[PDB]
Amino acid sequence: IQRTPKIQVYSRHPAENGKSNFLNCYVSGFHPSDIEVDLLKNGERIEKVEHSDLSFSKDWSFYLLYYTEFTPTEKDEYACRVNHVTLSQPKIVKWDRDM
Amino acid sequence: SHSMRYFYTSVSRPGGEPRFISVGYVDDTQFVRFDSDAASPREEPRAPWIEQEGPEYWDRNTQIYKAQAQTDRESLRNLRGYYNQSEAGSHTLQSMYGCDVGPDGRLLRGHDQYAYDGKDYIALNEDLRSWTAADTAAQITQRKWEAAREAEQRRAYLEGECVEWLRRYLENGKDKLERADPPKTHVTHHPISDHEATLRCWALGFYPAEITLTWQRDGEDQTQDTELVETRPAGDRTFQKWAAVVVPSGEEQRYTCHVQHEGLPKPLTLRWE
Amino acid sequence: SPRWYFYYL
Amino acid sequence: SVAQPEDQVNVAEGNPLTVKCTYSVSGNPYLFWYVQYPNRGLQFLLKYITGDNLVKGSYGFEAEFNKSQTSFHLKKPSALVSDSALYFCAVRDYNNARLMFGDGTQLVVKPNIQNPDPAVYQLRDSKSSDKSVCLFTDFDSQTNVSQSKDSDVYITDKCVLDMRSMDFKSNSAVAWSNKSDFACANAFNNSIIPEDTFFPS
Amino acid sequence: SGVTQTPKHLITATGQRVTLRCSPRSGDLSVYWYQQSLDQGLQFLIQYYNGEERAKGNILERFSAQQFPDLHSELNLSSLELGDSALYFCASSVSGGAYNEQFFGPGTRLTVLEDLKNVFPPEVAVFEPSEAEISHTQKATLVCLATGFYPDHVELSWWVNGKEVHSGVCTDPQPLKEQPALNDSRYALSSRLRVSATFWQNPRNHFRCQVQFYGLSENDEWTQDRAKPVTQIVSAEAWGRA
């Protein structure tokens, strides 16, 4: 069995420019547990990116949160790049600020 | 009504012991973890309230994890044999067990189930007396466990030690595990085109994770036309969710989002934009 | 705490 | 071809009303009345197809077909304020896929004010101040309110509200200015106002 | 009626193209399209009967219409010009026989602007009753004021403790011009809510005046300085004052 990751990029508290927050990248529903997940600022990977401990849901599918501390600004653009075996190439998902 | 649940993942590597990771939950609060990747693997805390536990707790539990990890490594070899797979090739064994207790404090239900390489493998029925095997290979394990009266031992654990650990943990963190944090709700609108617009209903910072968001068109529930994102972690032990509906433009005001949750005095209704 | 019962598959 | 020879018909609550429509159609016609309430679509009232030359429709309306005068006048015995709308008559001939409509006539049913209590009040913002409007209210329907002579003074048309829970109706106009240098008592000046108008301070 | 149309309001710029949707009443197989221009009354555009184009008025070449198998109709207006600005009516009957009355939907109000640079949402203020009125008549009149918006598609409603009220409301029939002799002026519209004086005194009563404005969609370009004037709701509130 393979299952494709459900990616959702978002923030801990609602974004307000020039107030520090957390940028989250929640990846779920994927199998196997081998997965690459990066945060990006303006295209470049962010350093000091922590993540949760691998776990799974009652339906056996895995989930990982990968968070970071950030301060959002009107010019800056934060993404999440995820790589997995179900994917043709890395998948990018842009932070929408309302999704 | 409350629960404790352990979630074990073992991933065997081509060449190296399997990686064994374990997480422990009470309700929807992760409270312990164990990762076989350290050079001195220790059960570590992830809730503030498990921290009242003295060093003996952590020492003993670490012993049990390392042993479980050991068992899992073997279970893993055994399974490669059952399915006629070469030793070459990573595999995944997942295990989940726990107890749900009543407002009483007694066992509602026990759980004890396994999955191999993604698929259901074997599980313990609700009587806590029999087994359900997914394929003919899992029936190998089934015969083995029945012959060894394994059901008696798990039922014993589930009814007894499980509940007592749970009862204690709930005492140790009553404030954090008995408050219900209700969602901070609101609605956003998006004029996606001339002839349609997106109404998206938010729920933020709630605990526990169970919630319902439903859009209604004039008290009619729009079950099939709504995008519902999987409840997601805030990062601070609370959860976010959203539900969104694409409505004709102009017929916007006929739509209302209904929020249900335990921390909510009474069901909310919202609308706008 | 984790269950001190391990069973081989 | 159809004709509505009046652009506006003014009537007072309670009295009979008549919107006229004449038609120029070869042979027996099919006639229709529609109403366009403000910021809605057209609504069908009634039609004449054949039979009784007095047809009864929606909203207590009716219309008399007169072959001799080629007329189809819309009539209602007792006018309501709510009857104020654009009224359109239409004809169809044997081969007309389309409704041929007239240019429309406006019905203005003036409310009947039992006890006029003319006043100009001043209302101030529930947020900042110096932001103030002037509400001329409770006047009788006959009072006309003209626009400002001042390029910077804004006056809305007269407008009737109805507090249905109390069976009470009222006329009102609103005026305001860009300038803070503008007086409730100097607003509404271009307009002839009753002499009895209660102005507080 | 039974005839529905989406959208109610459509703001675009010359050169663009738009599509109007209509749902005829259940059962109805004949669909009719009409244009209500302010200058020329109700004009007939085109008719479909059960999927096939039947009768045609003076429909321009840059116009067309369609009736789909589910019986819904569309009207497509391209290479738009300022002169296209009008109210567009869809209507339906069972058959196309002359004795048959046509049932109309609510219209789509279409406004074709020069460019979308001039579009501005309203600012919305509530004004509190005059104490004068309260002691004089035992009645309270609140006023809403939506100002400096363009163009003049707005829809206003009074919400009292989270429910929309109609009794005691009157809104201006049409918006007035904030600069009457400039052809591209902004606009303002006003409304009034009247309630009993006992009601306005209770400070536990909430009064909200809500203006929905009709502006851009997201598919519209916006390379201007300020924020994009999309369709939105601007509101204002006050509480009862004892």
Tab-separated table of C-alpha atoms in Angstrom, chain D residues 30 32 34 36 39-42 44 47 49 88 92-93 96-99 101 117 121-126 131-133 135 137-138 151 154-157 159-166 168 170 172-174 176 198 200, chain E residues 32 34 36 42 44 47 55-57 87 89 96-102 104-106 125-130 132-133 136-137 139 141 143 145 167-173 176-178 188 190 192 194-196 237-238:
chain	number	residue	atom	x	y	z
D	30	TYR	CA	-52.812	39.508	-25.584
D	32	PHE	CA	-50.028	41.979	-19.720
D	34	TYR	CA	-45.848	43.831	-14.788
D	36	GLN	CA	-40.761	46.567	-11.073
D	39	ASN	CA	-34.007	46.951	-6.920
D	40	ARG	CA	-36.009	43.845	-7.892
D	41	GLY	CA	-37.026	42.349	-11.239
D	42	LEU	CA	-40.334	42.449	-13.105
D	44	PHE	CA	-46.372	39.558	-13.304
D	47	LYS	CA	-53.157	39.617	-18.341
D	49	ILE	CA	-56.376	36.769	-23.071
D	88	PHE	CA	-45.108	48.192	-17.320
D	92	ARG	CA	-48.263	40.169	-27.690
D	93	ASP	CA	-49.595	39.680	-31.216
D	96	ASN	CA	-44.683	37.978	-31.346
D	97	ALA	CA	-42.194	35.797	-29.455
D	98	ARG	CA	-41.239	38.844	-27.407
D	99	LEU	CA	-43.297	40.903	-24.960
D	101	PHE	CA	-43.373	46.697	-23.401
D	117	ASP	CA	-44.745	66.630	13.755
D	121	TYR	CA	-32.778	66.748	14.466
D	122	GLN	CA	-28.978	66.398	14.732
D	123	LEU	CA	-27.406	62.962	15.111
D	124	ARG	CA	-23.720	62.498	16.014
D	125	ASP	CA	-21.427	59.532	15.234
D	126	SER	CA	-21.393	56.498	17.535
D	131	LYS	CA	-19.370	63.799	12.085
D	132	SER	CA	-23.053	64.736	12.202
D	133	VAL	CA	-26.064	64.302	9.944
D	135	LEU	CA	-32.564	64.353	9.873
D	137	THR	CA	-38.422	63.948	9.900
D	138	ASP	CA	-42.169	63.497	10.655
D	151	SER	CA	-21.991	72.202	-4.003
D	154	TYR	CA	-25.911	66.582	0.446
D	155	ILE	CA	-29.642	65.969	0.653
D	156	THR	CA	-31.330	62.615	0.147
D	157	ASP	CA	-34.758	62.282	-1.410
D	159	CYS	CA	-38.315	58.434	2.117
D	160	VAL	CA	-41.173	56.634	3.924
D	161	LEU	CA	-40.566	54.155	6.770
D	162	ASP	CA	-43.290	52.125	8.456
D	163	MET	CA	-43.098	50.821	12.022
D	164	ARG	CA	-45.467	47.894	11.266
D	165	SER	CA	-45.498	46.884	14.938
D	166	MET	CA	-47.314	50.203	15.722
D	168	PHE	CA	-47.225	54.244	12.087
D	170	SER	CA	-43.161	58.612	8.632
D	172	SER	CA	-37.701	61.599	6.453
D	173	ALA	CA	-34.864	63.226	4.565
D	174	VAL	CA	-31.208	63.265	5.503
D	176	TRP	CA	-24.915	66.338	5.754
D	198	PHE	CA	-39.571	72.044	15.796
D	200	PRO	CA	-33.981	71.719	18.998
E	32	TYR	CA	-35.985	34.797	-23.139
E	34	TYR	CA	-34.001	41.134	-22.317
E	36	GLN	CA	-33.300	47.104	-19.546
E	42	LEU	CA	-37.117	46.815	-21.932
E	44	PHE	CA	-35.735	41.877	-26.364
E	47	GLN	CA	-35.060	33.356	-27.309
E	55	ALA	CA	-36.444	34.360	-32.055
E	56	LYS	CA	-33.855	37.103	-32.190
E	57	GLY	CA	-34.110	40.821	-31.533
E	87	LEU	CA	-29.949	45.465	-16.375
E	89	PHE	CA	-33.238	39.983	-17.618
E	96	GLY	CA	-43.697	30.113	-26.835
E	97	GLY	CA	-47.437	30.736	-27.447
E	98	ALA	CA	-48.442	34.430	-27.344
E	99	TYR	CA	-51.061	34.016	-24.598
E	100	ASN	CA	-48.292	32.743	-22.296
E	101	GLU	CA	-46.972	35.218	-19.730
E	102	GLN	CA	-43.200	35.219	-19.218
E	104	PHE	CA	-38.745	37.094	-15.064
E	105	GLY	CA	-35.820	36.532	-12.762
E	106	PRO	CA	-34.198	39.325	-10.698
E	125	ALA	CA	-20.931	55.207	9.737
E	126	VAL	CA	-23.833	54.802	12.150
E	127	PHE	CA	-25.389	57.940	13.743
E	128	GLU	CA	-27.125	57.734	17.132
E	129	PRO	CA	-30.652	59.090	17.856
E	130	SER	CA	-31.136	62.750	18.873
E	132	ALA	CA	-34.543	65.683	21.151
E	133	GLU	CA	-36.442	63.031	19.177
E	136	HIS	CA	-40.331	64.615	21.754
E	137	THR	CA	-41.853	61.547	20.038
E	139	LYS	CA	-39.318	57.135	18.993
E	141	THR	CA	-34.192	57.068	14.578
E	143	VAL	CA	-29.069	56.640	10.495
E	145	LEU	CA	-24.247	56.537	5.939
E	167	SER	CA	-39.900	47.238	10.028
E	168	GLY	CA	-38.850	50.838	10.618
E	169	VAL	CA	-36.347	50.789	7.773
E	170	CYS	CA	-36.156	53.011	4.770
E	171	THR	CA	-33.116	53.234	2.503
E	172	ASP	CA	-32.458	55.841	-0.180
E	173	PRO	CA	-33.954	54.553	-3.477
E	176	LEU	CA	-26.446	60.465	-4.728
E	177	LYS	CA	-23.243	61.960	-6.244
E	178	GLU	CA	-20.528	63.304	-3.916
E	188	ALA	CA	-23.171	58.049	-1.146
E	190	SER	CA	-28.169	56.682	3.431
E	192	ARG	CA	-32.779	55.032	8.560
E	194	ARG	CA	-36.738	53.701	13.661
E	195	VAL	CA	-37.526	51.862	16.910
E	196	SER	CA	-39.396	52.574	20.153
E	237	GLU	CA	-22.465	49.334	15.021
E	238	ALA	CA	-23.867	51.061	18.108
